[PDB]
Ligand binder design. Structure first.
Ligand code: BCB
Ligand code: BCB
Ligand code: BCB
Ligand code: BCB
Ligand SMILES: C/C=C1/c2cc3[nH]c4c(c3C)C(=O)[C@H](C(=O)OC)c4c3nc(cc4[nH]c(cc(n2)[C@@H]1C)c(C(C)=O)c4C)[C@@H](C)[C@@H]3CCC(=O)OC/C=C(\C)CCC[C@H](C)CCC[C@H](C)CCCC(C)C
Ligand SMILES: C/C=C1\c2cc3[nH]c4c(c3C)C(=O)[C@H](C(=O)OC)c4c3nc(cc4[nH]c(cc(n2)[C@@H]1C)c(C(C)=O)c4C)[C@@H](C)[C@@H]3CCC(=O)OC/C=C(\C)CCC[C@H](C)CCC[C@H](C)CCCC(C)C
Ligand SMILES: CC(C)=CCC/C(C)=C/CC/C(C)=C/CC/C(C)=C/CC/C(C)=C/CC/C(C)=C/CC/C(C)=C/CC1=C(C)C(=O)c2ccccc2C1=O
Ligand code: HEM
Ligand code: HEM
Ligand code: HEM
Ligand SMILES: CC(C)=CCC/C(C)=C/C=C/C(C)=C/C=C/C(C)=C/C=C\C=C(C)\C=C\C=C(/C)CC/C=C(\C)CCCC(C)C
Ligand SMILES: [Fe+2]
Lengths: 332, 273, 243, 323
């Protein structure tokens, strides 16, 4: 009902604009204690020895690394992906080279993905970077995943109610509003923006006057595009535990420069990164994952904003393991 | 200089303080003690506004803006050009509003009438205090309040409205808007009804108070009356800020998330979730 | 090519912006402010055509008003200034000056839609009665501002057009007469009628009615203003500053 | 302080008054009943009520308009009555999603929305006749009808007129509690911030102005209720001490004053310009203005603030950046 005083607030614009984050000191401290569960880096190993390409039977990505570094990598991977089962979740106990189980082939595709984010998408991740834990958080299935339709609850670990289930058609708006931060926007921002590069987010014209040949009849973009942009931004703001002012001067949402904060550019690179992972990486693996993991339309669970962030402007409060594990990007 | 009936009403007495010393008229304006203080508050304010505007980038009325200090300054004293100007105009504004009310109290006592008008002006003063003094106090800085500019204060409401995702969903704002629309609608109904009876058109007779009561009984079925309409009109106008004062103050100190998310006491009840 | 882009750097939205401020100031300055001047003019100590209203019960009356006889005001100036206040020369309650001043209304009894006298007592209005739940003031004493029983309410005066009580008829103690008072000056109690406006020794000078069973608009102003004067003129302390 | 202004201390009761009109004196339906508690803050009598050929038709077109939306609200919660009461606020009827232009939208996509709005138009249209004819039957001015006409004039500007000008039925206002709330943001976004529209600025000024006027006038009449300031009809034709004290309060406060009748013209014109200025804004919105912020920048009305956080260029304009 109410969040008890006081409240921690910041400044993101010129004084008097009321720009900045509005945060509750109990909610954030509940988020830090969840994010502090980040497993610390493993001890430094010996760099002297032959690369694992000559040593082992089936290694195609981490082939340059030594046996000491490779085992360390696999010990770290288990601590972030499948610690409740262990090595045997993705391996056969007698054969570590064979690809008899499904979490092996997906893992190798996820490795090329994680390396790519810390090598190519550094405009977003910078020197902080991301690991396996940033999304998985010590579970094989990432808590926050998205299908081709809105689902509840956001965290899939939670036991859902009958109405919140995607099967019951009576609670569609319930699944629709919660993803758009409790708003009755009849638009899914994931399937229209976050999944593919089919739709342009920007809906506001850069001209003071309407150009002739675009502002009359079928030439016009429907108002639904302005709704969905607003529906996307709500999903964006709720996933980072912040508001518009963090990236916008509400005076003008379309303009960049003094009206935009250095984080809006990062957010833009966030949109372009999510799509590339969804399309090139998180879409073709539907044949790699079983029929149980799939949704309803034969699609694989894809990522968005909250997948790493989980309710904070930065995933895990600026925690970096990039230097600790150079095998996850950037790649030379 | 006076109305054809004013002379007999212009008498000594009615002042709260000052006595006979301030009791007189400047043209049509009455002064009193609070007339002197008000003018002083208005004078010193505009003078410092005229001093801050020459220290600004432009002279365009739409663009003229004087802003509060940074949030890191807190509720302490801020430098003149760094929100200090704003800190002086606020006190000057408050004093000008407070003294103007008490001046209207000094006028109401002289005419032997009710105290309803200066008591109705306490509401917009109260709402000015919520935005500029009350809500900033609970947070901990003077910078949260709005700047004094024609177009600049619109951008403050914009960001502050957007800080909690969607402001329409605010329960205090909902009722605030509800009373803003219902008061304007009633003034269109009341203002139109009085002119309809008095002016039937052409060479027709001015109707009676029974015709007032007959019209609404024929249109909607229920009439409030001739005295009660001015009571509700005052009620519907006051409750714009009365309900609005609780929507603004909750945003921040009592609620940090978005206001659509506040509607989670109804939807997520275990038995229909 | 832009929709609305005409000559120069101007646009259609800019032109209407001027046309918007055009019609407003025209309605405000050339009409609304002129209608504000139909009462209280000319200036003592731009004008509109004096408007005409056809009365509900035969006849007409033009605004503003010009009366055949003047009312002398028994007041004297405090000082030689133009906006200088005026001071009562005698008793302001009977002379009707300041808050005790009544307007120059017509001396006719107010009328309903059917013509009948609007403000009448319950002795003329027999079909009218007090609602169940509220107090019947007939037979309850009237205690004045000084805490003294000034009289006793004998009947109630009702508006026959709106179904609403307006006046309380009470026979003044030690006067043998009846004096009227608007309900606005009264605090209704179950045992008493509370009036803080005037002293008990001032209940006898309340403007007297021409008829016992009917009241005119001017008489409705004389009575209402009389108690309004007492707010500032009942005790020698009600005229000076509070603090 | 006056107690009669707070509440009716003693309420008056009697036989009800029936003012004969030109037509329809037998069309009055309802046995009059009286409430004691409502009589404290107003009039006790509730009823009777007139129907007429203009009143029943409006209920006929109105109910049909409401039946369409309520049936579309139940279809979203899959006929579930328990989920209909839980999600009622979020539920609503929406315009066409994809772009079709000015042709008739498909049943499932803005088709029922157009029909619900069509029965809405005839409902408000037939009610205006009820607002107009009742004044003409009782020998009054048509002031209330004209104030209602401007109110109707604004609804159609955001209902059918603006969609006709630009050429898209998707521009319209959806039905529902939150869905119509969501439109106010989606329409302010498309045309570059509605704060920089002068006519939005005017309408707000008149919307606030009606609040100021009614808080003043409402308190003013209550202040002179002891003199008979509530009897406004007899105060215009015959200037009483009530309106004399009412006019002299403001003259000594602000410098000038209205009359008893003219201040109602002030309250009516302010009410009228909440709808007139709002209509002109929407008419210019889309037809002659694409962005309202850039319009105040084009003319130089808009103010500018220094960058607290480093100025942020558009990453889309970078050489080789993804589209
Ligand atoms: C640009 C303007 C938009 C807008 C912006 C808006 C905002 C910002 C807000 C609303 C809100 C509301 N609007 Mg909306 N609106 C509404 C109605 C509504 C309600 C759902 C709600 C209540 C507002 C209110 O109190 O009104 C005033 C009521 C009047 C004038 C009638 C008086 C009714 C009275 C209280 C009832 C008394 C009768 C008793 C029941 C009888 C007594 C019984 C006894 C015998 C209708 C029916 C329409 C049309 C024309 O179809 C409309 C169009 C718009 N609104 C435009 C699209 N509206 C508020 C809300 O809560 O929604 C979330 C709100 O905050
Ligand atoms: C981003 C935009 C949102 C927003 C953000 C917002 C915020 C942040 C706040 C409001 C508030 C309010 N909004 Mg809202 N809003 C409103 C209307 C309203 C009001 C009902 C309400 C109260 C305004 C107020 O507090 O004035 C205050 C007026 C004051 C203080 C005037 C002081 C008077 C002073 C004493 C006298 C001045 C004297 C002068 C100096 C002398 C001048 C003399 C000259 C002539 C010489 C409507 C009708 C809509 C529609 C149609 O959508 C809407 C949408 C939005 N609002 C958007 C969703 N709104 C307020 C509220 O209470 O809601 C919770 C509020 O705080
Ligand atoms: C959420 C509520 C906020 C809000 C959001 C808001 C919006 C969205 C819009 C306005 C608009 C307006 N606001 Mg504003 N506002 C303003 C000023 C103004 C006016 C320029 C204008 C018309 C409002 C009106 O008609 O009122 C009733 C008063 C009347 C009719 C008397 C005339 C007063 C005159 C218009 C005010 C002139 C002020 C001058 C700049 C003079 C400054 C004083 C000098 C001597 C130093 C003041 C001075 C205050 C104070 C004292 O608190 C205030 C409170 C607020 N505004 C709240 C903080 N305001 C409208 C506008 O046109 O802005 C561009 C508009 O669209
Ligand atoms: C993101 C949000 C923005 C926004 C979006 C917005 C839009 C899109 C529009 C407005 C408009 C307006 N805004 Mg704004 N707004 C306003 C207030 C206002 C109003 C002055 C004005 C007209 C609203 C109105 O009176 O319609 C309420 C009254 C109505 C709708 C009349 C209803 C009467 C009807 C005939 C009766 C119908 C009821 C029947 C019983 C039902 C029968 C139907 C049946 C058959 C189903 C304030 C005070 C603020 C502040 C404080 O910032 C604000 C900020 C914003 N607005 C934000 C910047 N606003 C309107 C405007 O002025 O146009 C330019 C407008 O179109
Ligand atoms: C300056 C402009 C202001 C203004 C002015 C004016 N406003 C007027 C008049 C003026 C002058 C009158 O002439 C007229 C009236 O009569 O006076 C009471 C009226 C009205 N303004 C109403 C509501 C309103 N004003 C709003 C706003 C403003 N107003 C703005 C601020 C808003 C908002 C906030 O949007 C709302 C919702 C209604 C009470 C009434 C319409 C009745 C109707 O036309 O109903 C039409 C609908 C029907 C007849 C059907 C009714 C449905 C029944 C229950 C059948 C059951 C259905 C079933 C469940 C389905 C099967
Ligand atoms: C229920 C509440 C409603 C309501 C009610 C009533 N309203 C009343 C009364 C009642 C009863 C009167 O008694 C009194 C009056 O006289 O009758 C006209 C008054 C008044 N309401 C005014 C403005 C008004 N009403 C607003 C809102 C509502 N009214 C709501 C709807 C708004 C909005 C919405 O913003 C405004 C701007 C003034 C005209 C007048 C103050 C005069 C004054 O106090 O003089 C003394 C003060 C001055 C002359 C100015 C002082 C100079 C300072 C130092 C410099 C200015 C600094 C400033 C802070 C900078 C900001 C500018 C920037 C934003 C650009
Ligand atoms: C010369 C000098 C400085 C002397 C010193 C004395 C002194 C302190 C003077 C004060 C000087 C100052 C600051 C003056 C400025 C006063 C102000 C704030 C003026 C604002 C003017 C504006 C823009 C007003 C807009 C409000 C508006 C729409 C008004 C028009 C409608 C009117 C007049 C309403 C008032 C009014 C109401 C409300 C009634 O109910 C009523 C009932 C019966 C008869 C008359 C009336 C009546 O006139
Ligand atoms: C600490 C426990 C683990 C150990 C000791 C371990 C050990 C090994 C070994 C020895 C190989 C090479 C086998 C060969 O070809 O000869 C290998 C390959 C591989 N294993 Fe593991 N493993 C562990 C856990 C995991 C987990 C949890 C995953 C999946 C998340 C995984 C996925 C893979 C992949 C993708 C390869 C291919 C190497 C490459 O090309 O990068 N393993 N592992
Ligand atoms: C719900 C609150 C928000 C609203 C209403 C909002 C508003 C908007 C609007 C209307 C646009 C489109 C303007 C145009 O046409 O160019 C936009 C663009 C953008 N905003 Fe927001 N904003 C919000 C929150 C955020 C947040 C929290 C971020 C940062 C994480 C952000 C980052 C961006 C970016 C990157 C774009 C460019 C879109 C693109 O080109 O792909 N916004 N915003
Ligand atoms: C479209 C979806 C996303 C958006 C709009 C978004 C937005 C943002 C924004 C605005 C920041 C700046 C925070 C700050 O510096 O204070 C940020 C930082 C960050 N994001 Fe995202 N995010 C999204 C999804 C993701 C995903 C999928 C990942 C994982 C690859 C991710 C990883 C990170 C990391 C590691 C940082 C911190 C880097 C730094 O130090 O600035 N985000 N994001
Ligand atoms: C070529 C021709 C055929 C096309 C042109 C037709 C035409 C003129 C179309 C114009 C359509 C129009 C005017 C559309 C306007 C839509 C607008 C402005 C909608 C705005 C607001 C809608 C709102 C607030 C929704 C209200 C709905 C509800 C409150 C829901 C349910 C109703 C109730 C709960 C009240 C029932 C009462 C109950 C207690 C018995
Ligand atoms: Fe009135």
């Amino acid at each position: 009902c109410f969040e008890p005083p006081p409240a921690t607030t910041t400044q993101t614009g010129f004084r008097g604009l009321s720009m900045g984050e509005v945060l509750h000191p109990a909610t954030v401290k509940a988020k830090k204690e969840r994010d502090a569960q980040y497993p610390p880096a493993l001890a430094a190993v010996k760099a002297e020895g032959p690369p694992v390409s000559q040593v082992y039977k089936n290694v195609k990505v981490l082939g340059n690394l030594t046996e000491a570094e490779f085992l360390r990598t696999m010990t770290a991977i288990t601590e972030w992906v499948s610690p409740q089962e262990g090595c045997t979740y993705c391996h056969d106990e007698n054969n570590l080279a064979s690809e008899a189980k499904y979490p092996y082939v997906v893992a190798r595709r996820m490795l090329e993905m994680t390396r790519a984010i810390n090598t190519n998408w550094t405009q977003h991740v910078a020197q902080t970077g991301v690991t396996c834990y940033t999304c998985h958080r010590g579970t094989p299935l990432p808590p926050y995943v998205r299908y081709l339709e809105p689902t509840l609850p956001l965290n899939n670990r939670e036991t859902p109610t009958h109405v919140e289930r995607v099967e019951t058609r009576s609670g569609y708006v319930v699944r629709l509003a919660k993803y758009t931060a409790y708003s009755a926007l009849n638009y899914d921002p994931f399937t229209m923006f976050l999944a593919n590069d089919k739709r342009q987010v920007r809906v506001v014209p850069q001209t003071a006057l309407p150009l002739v040949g675009v502002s009359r009849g079928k030439e016009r973009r429907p108002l639904s595009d302005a709704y969905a942009t607003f529906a996307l931004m709500m999903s964006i703001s709720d996933s980072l535990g912040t508001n518009c002012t963090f990236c916008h001067n509400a005076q003008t949402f379309e303009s960049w420069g003094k009206k935009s904060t250095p984080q809006r550019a990062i957010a833009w690179w966030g949109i372009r990164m999510v799509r590339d992972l969804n399309m090139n990486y998180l879409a073709p693996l539907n044949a790699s994952l079983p029929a149980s993991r799939l949704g309803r339309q034969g699609e694989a669970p894809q990522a968005d904003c909250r997948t790493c962030h989980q309710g904070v402007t930065k995933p895990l409060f600026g925690a970096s393991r990039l230097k600790d594990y150079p095998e996850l990007g950037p790649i030379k | 200089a006076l109305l054809s009936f004013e002379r007999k009403y212009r008498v000594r007495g009615g002042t709260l303080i000052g006595g006979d010393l301030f009791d007189f008229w400047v043209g049509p304006y009455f002064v009193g003690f609070f007339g002197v203080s008000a003018i002083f508050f208005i004078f010193l304010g505009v003078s410092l506004i005229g001093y801050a505007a020459s220290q600004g980038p432009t002279w365009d009325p739409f663009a003229i803006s004087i802003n509060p200090p940074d949030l890191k300054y807190g509720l302490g004293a801020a430098p003149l050009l760094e929100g200090g100007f704003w800190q002086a105009i606020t006190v000057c504004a408050l004093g000008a509003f407070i003294s103007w009310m008490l001046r209207e109290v000094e006028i109401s006592r002289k005419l032997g009438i009710g105290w309803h008008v200066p008591l109705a002006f306490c509401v917009p003063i109260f709402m000015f205090c919520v935005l500029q003094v009350f809500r900033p106090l609970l947070l901990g800085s003077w910078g949260h309040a709005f700047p004094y500019g024609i177009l600049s204060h619109l951008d403050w409401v914009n960001n502050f409205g957007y800080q909690y995702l969607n402001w329409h969903y605010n329960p205090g704002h909902m009722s605030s808007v509800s009373f803003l629309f219902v008061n304007a609608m009633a003034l269109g109904l009341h203002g139109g009804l009085i002119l309809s009876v008095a002016n039937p058109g052409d060479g027709d007779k001015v109707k009676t108070a029974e015709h007032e009561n007959q019209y609404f009984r024929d249109v909607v079925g229920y009439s409030i009356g001739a005295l009660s309409i001015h009571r509700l009109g005052l009620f519907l106008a006051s409750n714009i800020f009365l309900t609005g004062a609780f929507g603004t103050i909750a945003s921040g100190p009592f609620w940090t998330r978005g206001w659509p998310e506040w509607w989670g006491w109804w939807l997520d009840i275990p038995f229909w979730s | 090519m832009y929709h609305g882009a005409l000559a120069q750097h101007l646009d259609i939205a800019q032109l209407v912006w001027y046309a918007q401020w055009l019609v407003i100031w025209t309605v405000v300055l050339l009409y609304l402010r002129r209608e504000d001047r139909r009462e209280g003019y000319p200036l003592v100590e731009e004008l509109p055509y004096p408007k005409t209203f056809v009365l509900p019960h035969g006849g007409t009356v033009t605004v503003p008003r010009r009366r055949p006889e003047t009312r002398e005001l028994k007041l004297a100036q405090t000082d030689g200034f133009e906006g200088a206040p005026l001071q009562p020369t005698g008793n302001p309650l009977v002379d009707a000056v300041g808050p005790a001043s009544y307007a120059e209304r017509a001396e006719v009894v107010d009328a309903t839609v059917d013509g009948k006298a609007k403000i009448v007592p319950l002795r003329v209005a027999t079909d009218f009665s007090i609602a169940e739940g509220d107090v019947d003031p007939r037979g309850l004493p009237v205690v004045a501002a000084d805490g003294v029983e000034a009289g006793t309410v004998t009947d109630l005066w009702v508006d026959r057009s709106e179904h609403y009580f307006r006046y309380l008829e009470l026979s003044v103690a030690g006067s043998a007469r009846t004096a009227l008072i608007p309900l606005g000056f009264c605090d209704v109690k179950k045992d008493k009628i509370v009036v803080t406006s005037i002293l008990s020794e001032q209940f006898a000078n309340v403007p007297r009615l021409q008829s016992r069973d009917q009241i005119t608009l001017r008489e409705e102003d004389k009575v209402s203003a009389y108690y309004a004067g007492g707010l500032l003129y009942a005790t020698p302390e009600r005229a000076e500053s509070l603090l | 302080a006056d107690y009669q202004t707070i509440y009716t201390q003693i309420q008056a009761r009697g036989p009800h008054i029936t003012v004969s009109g030109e037509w329809g004196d037998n069309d009055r339906v309802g046995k009059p009943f009286y409430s004691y508690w409502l009589g404290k803050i107003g009039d006790a009598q509730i009823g009777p009520i007139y129907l007429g050929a203009s009143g029943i038709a409006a209920f006929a077109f109105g109910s049909t308009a409401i039946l369409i939306i309520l049936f579309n609200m139940a279809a979203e919660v899959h006929f579930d009555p328990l989920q209909f009461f839980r999600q009622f606020f979020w539920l609503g009827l929406y315009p066409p999603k994809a772009q079709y232009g000015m042709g008739i939208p498909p049943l499932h996509d803005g088709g029922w929305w157009l029909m619900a709005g069509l029965f809405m138009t005839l409902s408000l249209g037939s009610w205006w006749i009820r607002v107009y004819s009742r004044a003409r039957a009782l020998g009054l001015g048509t002031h209330i009808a004209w104030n209602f006409a401007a109110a109707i004039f604004f609804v159609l500007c955001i209902g059918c007129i603006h969609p006709t000008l630009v050429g898209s039925w998707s521009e319209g206002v959806p039905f529902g509690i939150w869905p119509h709330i969501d439109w106010l943001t989606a329409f302010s976004i498309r045309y570059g911030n509605f704060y920089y529209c002068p006519w939005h600025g005017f309408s707000i000024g008149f919307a606030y102005g009606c609040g100021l006027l009614f808080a003043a006038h409402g308190a003013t009449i209550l202040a002179v209720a002891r003199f008979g300031g509530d009897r406004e009809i007899e105060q215009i034709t015959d200037r009483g001490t009530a309106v004399e004290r009412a006019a002299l309060f403001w003259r000594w406060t602000i410098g000038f004053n209205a009359t008893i009748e003219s201040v109602h013209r002030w309250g009516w014109f302010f009410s009228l310009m909440v709808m007139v200025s709002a209509s002109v804004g929407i008419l210019l919105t889309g037809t002659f203005v694409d962005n309202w912020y850039l319009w105040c920048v084009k003319h130089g009305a808009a103010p500018d603030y220094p960058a607290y956080l480093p100025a942020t260029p558009d990453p889309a304009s970078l050489p080789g950046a993804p589209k």
